[PDB]
């Protein structure tokens, strides 16, 4: 009915990737980074009103690895079927010339959660400023991801989100350009 | 406005 | 990726559903091997249940540990209602007012402006009502929308478009209703 809190973890082999996150109504409250073993908050403000002991997360990924091994054997090594993503590229708001804005790339309805994602400006890959989410859950058990790129908009600049995934025979590009 | 609790994962029967 | 070794995925999801605040709460533990959910705990039942044949074993096993069933039946209280209380002030209660703009556009690229866009962005939560008016009379026909779109940073956005022939002297009003405001947001555009 009204509100949904989800605790979602996964483990993926043979990449040995774990994730653990909390999700309030489709939006992420925090995830735990395996590498640093610490709680990353989606907004800095959340760190100020809540706490989480990240050792609980580590402990659960351990059990999920042990579980995945069991389930693998028992299925007779039947592997996941790759499901390629839908991708859309949107703005934060209506774009005016010379007003900083943010291109969003929505990656959606895919599995398993390995996905290579590049931003292109006039064909050339772009690193500065990019940031992204971890993979978020879905009722259907596929995944969603967001990439972000703040930019100063202009007539003579075009962008693309470029996504590669095992379920896609070719890299998938989604274009955006200033229209007036 | 407090600490958040994770529920605990349970091993399968080997 | 130049890599085609098969993959194997295990996921575990604990979902707490709340209805009418904390007054009704339903927890679900699911686990999922490779896109198929094998076994499920539902607080409405208080037992584990296999969802496929592959998970009848693990239901029987978990269903035989009474310390575990007891914990899980109590989790609606010690976990769900717990996290709700902890999160409430900044999730349930979070509110961000939308920026609203109107701007004219074209259904075809080099034709006449025949399309008013009502842009509504940076709002939270996601329940919105957006309505168009010509001269104080609501226009129900010729309206398309992007749907409600989630930016993934705890804000939402929507474009709501009215396909129209703008006749000079006409006043169009895009009207937005949202929990963050007690009376309707309105922006006007003069043809």
Residue numbers in the entry:
A (entry chain AAA): 3 to 182
B (entry chain CCC): 5 to 18
C (entry chain BBB): 0 to 190
From the manuscript:
We focused on the HLA class II molecule HLA-DR1 due to its high prevalence in the human population and the pre-existing molecular studies using this HLA type (Cole et al., 2012). Unbiased epitope mapping of the entire M1, NP, and PB-1 proteins revealed five IAV epitopes that elicited robust and reproducible responses across multiple HLA-DR1+ subjects. As part of our structural investigations, we solved pHLA crystal structures of three conserved IAV epitopes used for clonotypic analysis (HLA-DR1-SGP, HLA-DR1-QAR, and HLA-DR1-GMF; HLA-DR1-PKY from the F11 complex included for comparison).
Interestingly, both of these epitopes were found to be least immunogenic in both our mouse and human data. M1208-222-QAR specific repertoires were also directed to a single TRAV gene (TRAV38-2/DVB8, mean = 50%, n = 4; mainly coupled with TRAJ44, TRAJ45, and TRAJ49) and to a much lesser extent a single TRBV gene (TRBV20-1, 23%, n = 4). This was followed by M117-30-SGP that exhibited two TRAV gene biases (TRAV13-2, mean = 27%, n = 4; TRAV23/DV6, mean = 35%, n = 4) but no obvious TRBV gene bias. At the simplest level, they included measurable enrichments in total CDR3 charge or CDR3 hydrophobicity, which were clearly complementary to the surface electrostatics of pHLA crystal structures (highly acidic surface of HLA-DR1-SGP and highly basic surface of HLA-DR1-PKY), as well as the hydrophobic central surface of HLA-DR1-QAR.
